[PDB]
Amino acid sequence: DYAKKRGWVLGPNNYYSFASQQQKPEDTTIPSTELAKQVIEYARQLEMIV
Amino acid sequence: TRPANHRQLTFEEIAKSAKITVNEVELLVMKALSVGLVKGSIDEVDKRVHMTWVQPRVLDLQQIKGMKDRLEFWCTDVKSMEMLVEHQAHDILT
Amino acid sequence: HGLKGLNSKLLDIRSYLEKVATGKLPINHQIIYQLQDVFNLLPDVSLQEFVKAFYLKTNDQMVVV
């Protein structure tokens, strides 16, 4: 029952198969356009007459 | 040939393409750096020659169409992001 | 104004290049390789150390703001 449950199957003297890890890809400069929105809003609060 | 995404070229492809030996590659690219057509640098620990600049060459019609396509790809984003600054700021820029 | 001027200049360059590209006018042997060095520029925005420095300076500006 535990040999057929999920990944990491076991039975022949060692438990092998179905490894699980991560790669972590990133760019991190994607919200730059979003940053533009933020900084323009700042000037927005600085420039409409109270 | 490579489109400046991975401009770095390994020594193995240099010695396979130019059919020169293993230890004779570096002086060869030094000779290129002697003249001025090539403006790269060489890293010996990983043994890779990084590339910065290549002297221009003659181009034909299909290359001109590809250049025009890339220039249009650059031409669209200027308008597309001028709409960003003009649309989100009306009464500041007046 | 700078964005509009850049758009106008790139539109003129595209107009000339597609004019000489499609049969009309002779292929000038210069300019086409003089404008080749333009495209050798425009460095990779999705580069690790460039982004790592860019956020390092953006935070330094945001402290003052």
Side-chain angles (χ1 to χ4, degrees), chain A residues 1-9 11-14 17-50, chain B, chain C residues 1-24 26-34 36-43 45-65:
Chain A
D1 170 48
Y2 302 136
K4 316 306 155 217
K5 176 198 212 125
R6 293 182 183 174
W8 286 106
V9 283
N13 196 30
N14 194 1
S17 291
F18 212 117
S20 91
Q21 267 321 111
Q22 50 243 49
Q23 293 177 335
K24 203 191 172 293
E26 60 98 354
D27 175 41
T28 299
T29 196
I30 43 151
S32 64
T33 281
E34 162 62 39
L35 290 188
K37 298 187 186 296
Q38 294 192 357
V39 68
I40 294 162
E41 179 292 310
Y42 296 157
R44 197 136 59 245
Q45 294 300 320
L46 205 46
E47 273 317 317
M48 331 290 138
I49 285 97
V50 281
Chain B
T1 315
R2 293 182 183 174
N5 295 326
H6 218 72
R7 194 104 92 168
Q8 325 104 315
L9 275 66
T10 44
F11 59 88
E12 276 280 78
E13 75 194 276
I14 274 290
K16 183 57 215 72
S17 296
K19 54 190 302 176
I20 212 69
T21 88
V22 163
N23 296 315
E24 287 291 325
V25 287
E26 301 92 1
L27 306 97
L28 206 160
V29 71
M30 201 97 88
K31 183 61 176 179
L33 263 298
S34 80
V35 180
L37 275 66
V38 175
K39 284 209 278 271
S41 69
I42 303 106
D43 298 9
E44 285 252 7
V45 63
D46 42 317
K47 196 41 214 76
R48 281 139 61 158
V49 179
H50 184 80
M51 271 324 307
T52 76
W53 187 81
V54 63
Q55 75 103 37
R57 72 178 74 257
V58 293
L59 266 71
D60 214 327
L61 269 190
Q62 281 77 20
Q63 315 237 51
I64 289 321
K65 304 316 147 280
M67 294 300 293
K68 182 203 54 58
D69 289 345
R70 200 133 65 218
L71 163 67
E72 215 267 356
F73 218 59
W74 185 31
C75 183
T76 318
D77 59 43
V78 170
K79 193 56 159 156
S80 295
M81 214 268 278
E82 174 49 50
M83 289 315 89
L84 201 75
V85 55
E86 183 178 2
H87 170 266
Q88 243 175 279
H90 283 9
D91 304 1
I92 297 181
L93 75 83
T94 59
Chain C
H1 264 226
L3 260 296
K4 298 322 283 167
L6 193 300
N7 221 14
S8 182
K9 291 315 220 61
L10 274 191
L11 264 180
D12 297 2
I13 282 299
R14 207 271 305 283
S15 75
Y16 154 75
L17 205 38
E18 183 178 2
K19 168 246 196 164
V20 298
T22 51
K24 169 62 192 89
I27 295 184
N28 181 213
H29 182 62
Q30 186 173 355
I31 284 286
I32 51 160
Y33 63 89
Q34 213 281 332
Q36 198 269 342
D37 289 345
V38 156
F39 280 59
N40 186 340
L41 271 307
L42 314 171
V45 188
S46 157
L47 183 63
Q48 200 54 47
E49 60 268 29
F50 176 57
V51 161
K52 183 178 179 180
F54 195 56
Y55 285 129
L56 177 63
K57 274 288 206 164
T58 316
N59 285 321
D60 283 333
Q61 277 199 237
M62 282 302 146
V63 152
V64 154
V65 179

Short mmCIF file of all heavy atoms in Angstrom, two decimals, chain B residues 7 28-42 49-57, chain C residues 40:
data_model
loop_
_atom_site.label_atom_id
_atom_site.label_comp_id
_atom_site.label_asym_id
_atom_site.label_seq_id
_atom_site.Cartn_x
_atom_site.Cartn_y
_atom_site.Cartn_z
N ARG B 7 26.57 35.39 -26.50
CA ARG B 7 27.70 35.79 -27.38
C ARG B 7 28.98 35.07 -26.93
O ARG B 7 29.87 34.93 -27.76
CB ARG B 7 27.90 37.31 -27.37
CG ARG B 7 28.82 37.80 -28.48
CD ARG B 7 28.03 38.44 -29.61
NE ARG B 7 27.89 39.87 -29.41
CZ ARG B 7 27.44 40.72 -30.33
NH1 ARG B 7 27.10 40.28 -31.52
NH2 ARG B 7 27.35 42.01 -30.05
N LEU B 28 45.60 33.18 -31.07
CA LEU B 28 44.79 33.45 -32.25
C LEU B 28 43.79 34.57 -31.97
O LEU B 28 43.73 35.54 -32.73
CB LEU B 28 44.08 32.17 -32.68
CG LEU B 28 43.64 31.94 -34.13
CD1 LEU B 28 43.45 30.45 -34.36
CD2 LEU B 28 42.37 32.69 -34.48
N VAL B 29 43.07 34.50 -30.85
CA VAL B 29 42.09 35.55 -30.62
C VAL B 29 42.82 36.81 -30.18
O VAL B 29 42.36 37.93 -30.47
CB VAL B 29 40.98 35.12 -29.63
CG1 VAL B 29 41.47 34.98 -28.21
CG2 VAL B 29 39.81 36.08 -29.68
N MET B 30 44.02 36.65 -29.60
CA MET B 30 44.87 37.80 -29.32
C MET B 30 45.25 38.51 -30.60
O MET B 30 45.24 39.75 -30.66
CB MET B 30 46.12 37.35 -28.56
CG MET B 30 46.80 38.47 -27.80
SD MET B 30 46.33 38.49 -26.06
CE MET B 30 47.56 37.38 -25.39
N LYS B 31 45.49 37.73 -31.67
CA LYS B 31 45.77 38.32 -32.97
C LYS B 31 44.58 39.11 -33.48
O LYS B 31 44.75 40.20 -34.03
CB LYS B 31 46.15 37.22 -33.97
CG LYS B 31 46.54 37.74 -35.34
CD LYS B 31 47.76 38.64 -35.24
CE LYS B 31 48.23 39.08 -36.61
NZ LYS B 31 49.40 40.00 -36.52
N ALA B 32 43.37 38.60 -33.24
CA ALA B 32 42.17 39.38 -33.56
C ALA B 32 42.13 40.64 -32.72
O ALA B 32 41.94 41.74 -33.25
CB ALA B 32 40.92 38.53 -33.33
N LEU B 33 42.44 40.50 -31.43
CA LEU B 33 42.50 41.67 -30.56
C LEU B 33 43.71 42.53 -30.88
O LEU B 33 43.78 43.68 -30.45
CB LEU B 33 42.53 41.23 -29.10
CG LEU B 33 41.21 41.22 -28.33
CD1 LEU B 33 40.66 42.63 -28.26
CD2 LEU B 33 40.20 40.26 -28.93
N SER B 34 44.67 41.99 -31.64
CA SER B 34 45.78 42.81 -32.10
C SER B 34 45.31 43.80 -33.15
O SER B 34 45.81 44.93 -33.21
CB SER B 34 46.89 41.92 -32.65
OG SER B 34 46.62 41.50 -33.97
N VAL B 35 44.34 43.41 -33.98
CA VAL B 35 44.07 44.24 -35.16
C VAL B 35 42.97 45.25 -34.86
O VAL B 35 43.12 46.45 -35.13
CB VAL B 35 43.72 43.36 -36.37
CG1 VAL B 35 43.44 44.24 -37.57
CG2 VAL B 35 44.85 42.39 -36.66
N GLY B 36 41.86 44.79 -34.30
CA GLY B 36 40.76 45.69 -33.96
C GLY B 36 39.42 45.31 -34.53
O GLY B 36 38.45 46.06 -34.33
N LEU B 37 39.28 44.18 -35.23
CA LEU B 37 37.97 43.75 -35.68
C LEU B 37 37.14 43.19 -34.53
O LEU B 37 35.91 43.20 -34.59
CB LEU B 37 38.06 42.69 -36.78
CG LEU B 37 38.23 43.02 -38.27
CD1 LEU B 37 39.57 43.68 -38.56
CD2 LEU B 37 38.02 41.82 -39.16
N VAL B 38 37.81 42.71 -33.49
CA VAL B 38 37.21 42.00 -32.37
C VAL B 38 37.58 42.73 -31.09
O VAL B 38 38.75 43.10 -30.90
CB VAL B 38 37.70 40.54 -32.35
CG1 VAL B 38 37.20 39.80 -31.16
CG2 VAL B 38 37.27 39.83 -33.62
N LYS B 39 36.60 42.96 -30.22
CA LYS B 39 36.83 43.73 -29.00
C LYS B 39 36.40 42.95 -27.76
O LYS B 39 35.71 43.46 -26.88
CB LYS B 39 36.11 45.07 -29.04
CG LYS B 39 36.78 46.10 -29.92
CD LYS B 39 36.50 47.51 -29.43
CE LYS B 39 35.16 48.02 -29.90
NZ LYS B 39 35.27 48.70 -31.21
N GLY B 40 36.81 41.69 -27.67
CA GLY B 40 36.43 40.83 -26.57
C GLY B 40 37.49 40.73 -25.49
O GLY B 40 38.47 41.47 -25.46
N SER B 41 37.27 39.78 -24.58
CA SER B 41 38.20 39.46 -23.51
C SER B 41 38.13 37.97 -23.25
O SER B 41 37.18 37.30 -23.66
CB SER B 41 37.88 40.26 -22.24
OG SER B 41 36.67 39.81 -21.67
N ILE B 42 39.15 37.44 -22.58
CA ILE B 42 39.32 36.00 -22.42
C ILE B 42 39.37 35.67 -20.94
O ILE B 42 40.14 36.29 -20.19
CB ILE B 42 40.59 35.49 -23.13
CG1 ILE B 42 40.56 35.86 -24.62
CG2 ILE B 42 40.70 33.98 -23.00
CD1 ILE B 42 41.50 36.98 -24.99
N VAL B 49 35.79 32.80 -24.03
CA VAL B 49 36.10 34.12 -24.56
C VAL B 49 34.81 34.91 -24.63
O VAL B 49 33.95 34.64 -25.48
CB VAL B 49 36.77 34.03 -25.94
CG1 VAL B 49 37.06 35.42 -26.48
CG2 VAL B 49 38.04 33.21 -25.84
N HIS B 50 34.67 35.88 -23.73
CA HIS B 50 33.51 36.74 -23.76
C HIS B 50 33.60 37.69 -24.94
O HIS B 50 34.68 38.10 -25.37
CB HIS B 50 33.37 37.52 -22.46
CG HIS B 50 32.13 38.35 -22.38
ND1 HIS B 50 30.90 37.81 -22.07
CD2 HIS B 50 31.92 39.66 -22.63
CE1 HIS B 50 29.98 38.77 -22.10
NE2 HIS B 50 30.58 39.90 -22.44
N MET B 51 32.44 38.05 -25.47
CA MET B 51 32.34 38.89 -26.65
C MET B 51 31.59 40.17 -26.33
O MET B 51 30.57 40.15 -25.63
CB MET B 51 31.64 38.14 -27.78
CG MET B 51 32.54 37.32 -28.72
SD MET B 51 34.19 37.92 -29.17
CE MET B 51 33.85 39.57 -29.80
N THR B 52 32.12 41.28 -26.83
CA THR B 52 31.50 42.59 -26.69
C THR B 52 31.12 43.19 -28.03
O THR B 52 30.03 43.77 -28.15
CB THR B 52 32.44 43.56 -25.95
OG1 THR B 52 33.47 44.00 -26.85
CG2 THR B 52 33.08 42.91 -24.74
N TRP B 53 31.98 43.09 -29.03
CA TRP B 53 31.80 43.85 -30.26
C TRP B 53 32.41 43.10 -31.44
O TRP B 53 33.47 42.48 -31.33
CB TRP B 53 32.45 45.22 -30.14
CG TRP B 53 32.18 46.14 -31.27
CD1 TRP B 53 31.07 46.89 -31.46
CD2 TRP B 53 33.05 46.42 -32.36
NE1 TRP B 53 31.19 47.62 -32.61
CE2 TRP B 53 32.40 47.35 -33.18
CE3 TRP B 53 34.32 45.97 -32.73
CZ2 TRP B 53 32.97 47.85 -34.34
CZ3 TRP B 53 34.89 46.47 -33.88
CH2 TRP B 53 34.21 47.40 -34.67
N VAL B 54 31.73 43.19 -32.58
CA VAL B 54 32.17 42.59 -33.83
C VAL B 54 32.05 43.65 -34.91
O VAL B 54 31.06 44.38 -34.95
CB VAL B 54 31.34 41.32 -34.15
CG1 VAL B 54 29.87 41.68 -34.36
CG2 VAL B 54 31.89 40.57 -35.36
N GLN B 55 33.09 43.77 -35.74
CA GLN B 55 33.08 44.76 -36.80
C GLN B 55 32.00 44.43 -37.83
O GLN B 55 31.68 43.26 -38.04
CB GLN B 55 34.46 44.86 -37.45
CG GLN B 55 34.84 43.74 -38.39
CD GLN B 55 34.72 44.15 -39.84
OE1 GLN B 55 35.03 45.29 -40.20
NE2 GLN B 55 34.27 43.23 -40.68
N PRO B 56 31.37 45.44 -38.42
CA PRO B 56 30.23 45.18 -39.30
C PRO B 56 30.65 44.58 -40.62
O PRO B 56 31.81 44.68 -41.04
CB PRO B 56 29.61 46.57 -39.50
CG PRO B 56 30.19 47.42 -38.43
CD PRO B 56 31.55 46.88 -38.19
N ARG B 57 29.69 43.93 -41.28
CA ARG B 57 29.93 43.24 -42.53
C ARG B 57 28.81 43.56 -43.51
O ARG B 57 27.86 44.27 -43.17
CB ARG B 57 30.04 41.73 -42.30
CG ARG B 57 28.73 41.05 -41.98
CD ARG B 57 28.91 39.55 -41.80
NE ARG B 57 29.56 39.23 -40.53
CZ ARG B 57 30.83 38.88 -40.41
NH1 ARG B 57 31.63 38.81 -41.46
NH2 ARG B 57 31.31 38.59 -39.21
N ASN C 40 23.95 46.09 -32.13
CA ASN C 40 24.91 45.43 -31.25
C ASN C 40 24.85 46.01 -29.84
O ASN C 40 25.29 45.37 -28.89
CB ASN C 40 26.32 45.55 -31.82
CG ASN C 40 27.33 44.76 -31.02
OD1 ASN C 40 27.09 44.42 -29.86
ND2 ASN C 40 28.46 44.45 -31.64
#
